[PDB]
Design a protein around this motif. Structure first.
Motif, mmCIF file in Angstrom:
data_model
loop_
_atom_site.group_PDB
_atom_site.id
_atom_site.type_symbol
_atom_site.label_atom_id
_atom_site.label_comp_id
_atom_site.label_asym_id
_atom_site.label_seq_id
_atom_site.Cartn_x
_atom_site.Cartn_y
_atom_site.Cartn_z
ATOM 1 N N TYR A 131 -11.268 -6.727 1.965
ATOM 2 C CA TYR A 131 -11.343 -5.523 2.786
ATOM 3 C C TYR A 131 -12.433 -4.540 2.341
ATOM 4 C CZ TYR A 131 -6.711 -7.271 4.036
ATOM 5 O OH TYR A 131 -5.654 -8.062 4.405
ATOM 6 N N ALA A 132 -13.065 -4.807 1.200
ATOM 7 C CA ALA A 132 -14.129 -3.943 0.684
ATOM 8 C C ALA A 132 -15.157 -3.512 1.745
ATOM 9 C CB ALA A 132 -14.825 -4.610 -0.492
ATOM 10 N N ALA A 146 -14.224 -0.504 3.638
ATOM 11 C CA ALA A 146 -13.643 0.498 2.755
ATOM 12 C C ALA A 146 -13.857 1.905 3.276
ATOM 13 C CB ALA A 146 -14.214 0.373 1.354
ATOM 14 N N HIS A 182 0.824 -1.206 0.000
ATOM 15 C CA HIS A 182 0.000 0.000 0.000
ATOM 16 C C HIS A 182 0.861 1.260 0.000
ATOM 17 C CE1 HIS A 182 -2.565 3.209 1.762
ATOM 18 N NE2 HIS A 182 -3.511 2.635 1.040
ATOM 19 N N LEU A 198 -10.701 3.796 1.828
ATOM 20 C CA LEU A 198 -9.900 3.325 0.701
ATOM 21 C C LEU A 198 -10.083 4.260 -0.497
ATOM 22 C CD1 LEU A 198 -10.590 -0.505 1.068
ATOM 23 C CD2 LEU A 198 -8.745 0.852 2.076
ATOM 24 N N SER A 199 -9.522 3.897 -1.645
ATOM 25 C CA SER A 199 -9.520 4.782 -2.809
ATOM 26 C C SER A 199 -10.924 5.131 -3.324
ATOM 27 C CB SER A 199 -8.679 4.170 -3.934
ATOM 28 O OG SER A 199 -9.184 2.903 -4.315
ATOM 29 N N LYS A 251 -12.535 -4.101 -6.488
ATOM 30 C CA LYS A 251 -11.093 -4.339 -6.605
ATOM 31 C C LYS A 251 -10.382 -4.484 -5.241
ATOM 32 C CE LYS A 251 -8.907 0.245 -6.876
ATOM 33 N NZ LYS A 251 -8.831 1.486 -7.693
ATOM 34 N N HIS A 252 -10.885 -3.815 -4.206
ATOM 35 C CA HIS A 252 -10.274 -3.904 -2.870
ATOM 36 C C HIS A 252 -10.436 -5.259 -2.163
ATOM 37 C CE1 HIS A 252 -8.787 0.135 -2.816
ATOM 38 N NE2 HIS A 252 -9.987 0.671 -2.957
#
Lengths: 28, 348
Positions: free
Chosen positions: B256-257, B260, B65, B265-266, B252-253
Motif C-alpha cells: 500500500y506504500a 500512502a 488498523h 498513512l503514518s 513498512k506500509h
C-alpha cells in the motif's frame, strides 16, 4: 557507464519495501 | 477508535440502488456512509457473502488498523430512512431523503458508482479542479475506448464535486477501491477493469517528486546500484539519515506504500522534497549535469551554490568513469593515453 537510475524500478522497490532501504543506505 | 456498524438484508440490490439514488440527490451521510459504502462494496465485490467479505484480507487489515465492525441483522426493510437511527443530523438528512422523488430511477448499479468513484483516485490528492478535469478526460477516454458508458446525470459538476468531497473525506471507500484494484483483481467485469486501471494509475500519487529525487540520489554501476557518493558527504549525513528513517517508516506500509499519500498513512507526512533541501538540490544538480531537468523541485538560493557544485562534481565523475572504462577494454598504453587525450579534448 554510471548514471542515475531513471527507470524508477529501484525507488519503487525501496518505497514498496521489496528492497530494504538499508541494503542501499549503508554508513559502514 | 471508531466502530462501523454493518447491516444484513435479504434484498441488497434495492438498498444499493436506493443509496446510489441518495448520492445522486447528494445527501450528506456522515456516520452511515461507511455502512452504505460497505454494502455497495459487498454487493459488487464480495457478492453479498458476509462471511467471505469478513474473512477477506481488506477487512482483517482494517480491523488490524483500528476501524472495527459489527453485524446488524435487518431483513425487513424497503425504504432507506429506517436504517439510519442515530440521532446526529438524522432529521436533516431525512428531510433530504423525503425530499427525493420516488418516481425516477437511473440505470446504474454499485460497480458503476464504484468505478466512477475510482476515476477520482489518481489526481484526487492534487486539487479539486485537476482531479475533476482528470475524471472528465478519463471518462471521455473510456467512452472513446467504448469500455463503459456512464450516466450523463453523473457528469454534472456538482455531482462530481460531491463525490469528490466524499472521496476526500472518507477513507474506507478509498481503501476498498484500491484494495480491489490491486489485491483481488480477478473477474471478467468492465467496472473491475476500470477500477484496476484507475488504481494502477493512482500509484505514488503525491510522491512522484520525492520518488524521482530518490531516483537521482541513486546511482547505477557495474556493481549493481548504489547510493550516490555525493549523498554520502558529511554535511548532508543527518538529512540522509532522517530521509532513510522516513523512507523506512514509509516502506513498512508494504504494498500500500504507493497509496500512502492518498490514504494518508503514518510516515507519509515526513516525505516532502522541501524537507530534504540538500538532497533535492544534489539530485537536481545530478539531473542537470546529465542533461535532463527535475520537475517540481524549486531550490533554495543558499542551495543554488550546492546544486551548482553538484552538477560539476557529477560531470567530473562522469568524465573520470571514461578513463576507467578504457582500462577494461584491450589496448596499448599509448592508445589509451591518446584516447584519454581525446576525452580531454572533446570535453574541452
Amino acid at each position: 557507464m554510471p548514471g542515475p537510475e531513471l527507470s524508477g524500478w529501484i525507488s519503487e522497490q525501496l518505497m514498496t519495501g521489496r528492497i530494504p532501504v538499508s541494503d542501499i543506505f549503508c554508513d559502514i | 477508535q471508531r466502530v462501523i456498524p454493518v447491516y444484513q438484508v435479504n434484498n441488497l440490490e434495492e438498498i444499493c440502488q436506493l443509496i446510489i439514488q441518495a448520492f445522486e440527490a447528494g445527501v450528506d451521510f456522515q456516520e452511515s456512509a461507511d455502512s452504505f459504502l460497505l454494502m455497495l462494496c459487498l454487493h459488487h465485490a464480495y457478492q453479498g457473502d458476509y462471511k467471505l467479505f469478513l474473512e477477506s484480507g481488506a477487512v482483517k487489515y482494517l480491523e488490524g488498523h483500528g476501524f472495527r465492525f459489527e453485524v446488524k441483522k435487518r431483513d425487513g426493510v424497503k425504504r432507506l430512512e429506517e436504517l439510519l437511527p442515530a440521532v446526529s443530523s438524522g432529521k436533516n438528512i431525512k428531510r433530504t431523503l423525503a425530499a427525493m422523488p420516488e418516481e425516477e430511477t437511473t440505470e446504474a448499479n454499485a460497480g458503476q458508482f464504484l468505478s466512477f468513484a475510482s476515476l477520482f483516485l489518481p489526481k484526487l490528492v492534487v486539487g479539486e479542479k485537476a482531479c475533476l478535469e482528470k475524471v472528465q478526460r478519463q471518462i471521455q477516454v473510456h467512452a472513446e475506448q467504448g469500455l463503459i458508458q456512464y450516466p450523463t446525470a453523473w457528469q454534472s459538476v456538482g455531482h462530481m464535486m460531491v463525490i469528490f468531497r466524499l472521496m476526500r473525506t472518507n477513507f474506507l471507500i478509498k481503501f476498498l477501491l484500491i484494495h480491489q484494484g490491486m489485491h483481488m483483481v480477478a473477474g471478467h467485469d468492465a467496472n473491475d477493469a476500470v477500477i484496476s486501471n484507475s488504481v494502477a494509475q493512482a500509484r505514488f500519487s503525491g510522491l512522484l517528486i520525492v520518488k524521482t529525487v530518490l531516483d537521482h540520489i541513486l546511482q547505477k554501476t557495474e556493481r549493481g546500484v548504489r547510493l550516490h557518493p555525493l549523498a554520502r558527504t558529511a554535511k548532508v549525513k543527518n538529512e540522509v539519515n532522517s530521509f532513510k528513517a522516513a523512507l523506512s517508516s514509509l516502506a513498512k506500509h508494504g504494498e500500500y506504500a504507493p497509496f500512502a499519500r492518498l490514504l494518508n498513512l503514518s510516515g507519509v507526512n515526513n516525505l516532502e522534497h522541501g524537507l530534504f533541501p540538500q538532497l533535492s538540490a544534489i539530485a537536481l544538480g545530478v539531473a542537470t549535469a546529465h542533461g535532463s531537468t527535475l520537475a517540481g523541485v524549486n531550490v533554495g538560493e543558499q542551495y543554488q551554490q550546492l546544486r551548482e557544485a553538484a552538477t560539476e562534481a557529477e560531470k567530473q565523475l562522469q568524465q573520470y568513469a571514461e578513463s576507467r572504462e578504457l582500462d577494461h577494454l584491450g589496448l596499448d598504453d599509448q592508445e589509451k593515453k591518446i584516447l584519454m587525450n581525446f576525452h580531454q579534448k572533446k570535453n574541452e
